[PDB]
Amino acid sequence: SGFRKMAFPSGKVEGCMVQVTCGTTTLNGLWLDDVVYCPRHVICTSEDMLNPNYEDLLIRKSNHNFLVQAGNVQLRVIGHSMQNCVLKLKVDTANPKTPKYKFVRIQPGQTFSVLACYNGSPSGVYQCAMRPNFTIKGSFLNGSCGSVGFNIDYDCVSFCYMHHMELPTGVHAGTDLEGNFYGPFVDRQTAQAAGTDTTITVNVLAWLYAAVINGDRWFLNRFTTTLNDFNLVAMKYNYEPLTQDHVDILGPLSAQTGIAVLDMCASLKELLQNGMNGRTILGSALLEDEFTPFDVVRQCSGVT
Amino acid sequence: SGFRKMAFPSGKVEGCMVQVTCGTTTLNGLWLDDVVYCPRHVICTSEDMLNPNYEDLLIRKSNHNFLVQAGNVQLRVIGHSMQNCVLKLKVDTANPKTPKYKFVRIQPGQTFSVLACYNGSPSGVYQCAMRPNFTIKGSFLNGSCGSVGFNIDYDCVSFCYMHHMELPTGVHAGTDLEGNFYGPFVDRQTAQAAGTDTTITVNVLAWLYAAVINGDRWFLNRFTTTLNDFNLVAMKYNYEPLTQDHVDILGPLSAQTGIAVLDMCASLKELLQNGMNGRTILGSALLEDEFTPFDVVRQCSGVT
Secondary structure (H helix, E strand, O other): OOOOOOOOOOHHHHEEEEEEEOEEEEEEEEEEEOOEEEEHHOOOOOHHOOOOOOOHHOOOOOOOEEEEEEEEEEEEEEEEEEOOOOEEEEEEOOOOOOEEEEOOOOOOOOEEEEEEEEEOEEEEEEEEEOOOOOOOOOOOOHHHHHHHEEEOOOEEEEEEEEEEEEOOOOOEEEOOOOOEOOOOOOOOOOOOOOOOOOOOOOHHHHHHHHHHHOOOOOOOOOOOOOHHHHHHHHOOOOOOOOOOOHHOOOOHHHHHHOOHHHHHHHHHHHHHHHHOOOOOEEEEEOOOOOOOOHHHOOOHHHOO | OOOOEEEEOOHHHHHHEEEEOOOOOEEEEEEEEEEEEEHHHHHHHEEEEEEEEHHHHOOOOOOEEEEEOOOEEEEEEEEEEEOOHHHEEEEOOOOOOEEEEEEOOOOOOOEEEEEEEEOEEEEEEEEOOOOOOOOOOOOOOOOOOOEEEEEOOOOEEEEEEEEEOOOOOOOOEOOOOOOOEOOOOOOOOOOOOOOOOOEOHHHHHHHHHHHHHHHOOOOOOOOOOHHHHHHHHHHHOOOOOOOHHHHOOOOHHHHHHOOOOOHHHHHHHHHHOOOOOOOOOOOOOOOOOOOHHHHHHHHHHOOO
8 A cells, every 4th residue: 555656766777877078078878779869959059049050060079078977987989960859879899788769759748757967877766747838847056968868668668758947937848769859848048938747637537546455535525527517617727628538547456446527527627626625645746647547557566 | 946845866775675475474675785774564463463472472483484575586594583673584605696785773853754654565665754753744554664865975775764664644654764763653553553643844945945946035134133033933833942063053055045044044033923924935835844954955966
């Protein structure tokens, strides 16, 4: 029993982190096979970041200008290319600790673990969600760029995120491992405002199911609702519309608890309309939306 | 910027987890040097757990009755002893992945990372605090016993916790790595009620400092207080008494933010008396007490 904001074990990703230095800029790289992936803004002076022309900046860089250190051993850079907003540094040594891996582009509402790194060294691991506005709410200081987000499926690391930017509002923007930003963000120090940070309704419902499974039941009510009725209330509270796809995804939690998804929707409707009245659910005074239905099943069943 | 409930990177501890089986009971062990540490209740049938005589139960066990598997390779058990509530299984092979390590007994209010494991396989990592009543609020299913709690200081793992028990209230009890329970708990399936789960005041204050550092300032007020005045309010709200030792420990956060500890105490006093009025602090609607002053400094400075 008990339900915790749980990250994937980070060892497999720890073995992939390196330091990348170009001129005076140091950040993190991801070493898989004989390629090191890092944010292309490694080539920028903070001055460059105001209006960088990356293709022009990159012309002035050679293989020997990219200093790649794995622990306290230097890797030899034999090639470099830009793919979207990431640099791929070809090295002469395959990472001997390369796990089975994939690159995946996640959807908003999907959760992942971040291994926060500085100078290629892991400092910590925490669980995130891709927000509906394609930001994440991370913990990233200067030097943390190139820190990665991931999921693990048994022995296969799916990399979904590389850290690039903090917006002036202190929220975070990055890319997939093909270097494509999540959302409309660019690797330039300019005005970039995030859109509405809506609540991930399907994740809230998953977490309410987690609460019931774990003995927190005070919020279960005598009501039901419809998708359309619930959605009128979701809209008012800046919750994402709930779709039949979401209801289908919650089916196994519905089944396990014997609470129909639309009944749990009606419980969530009353919580939105009435608030918590100073009560808590799984040690939270707000409705948690950074657990997916898959997360709740995994944690409640003990998948390794 | 941003402040997250962050666990230590778990790789060093992942390399230490093994499976221990005795008869039909399987749980986790910690492999350091040529010793595997596991809960002594590995020798119990669920029947035994009602009133176990561990010395008597252990007489019927030989080295070959303890099956220890590290990945899918069996370790040869050449000795076994009971120390308090843990078994030490001597194996013929030193763990080649043994990190630098210490065994530490933590105080209530101290935080640590848990690597939740099943069948010697890591499922997840999360951050805990030793509660003032010497419980932890974990996420542990059947098979999770022998999962460990730890802190990392650069390259040295300090092991502070081994998981043993869930109380009927769904909170968790375990030992240090010398096998001494935290608090008054015993490895017996009997009535064991936890005492008052008080709030770790010094950790709340640390987290309020983290909030200010991260731009969340709405709760800073025009007031100050005294330790004695604050403590009258702490008592009423089941907060731990604040001591001059706590004020001294908060000194670096006081210094960095320029907010006197007793001024932050007066902000916390108003939050207790007035509540949050539907506002949040670092994405929480309650006062977070599972960050130590050391945690806040580490995260806010980016220690690896």
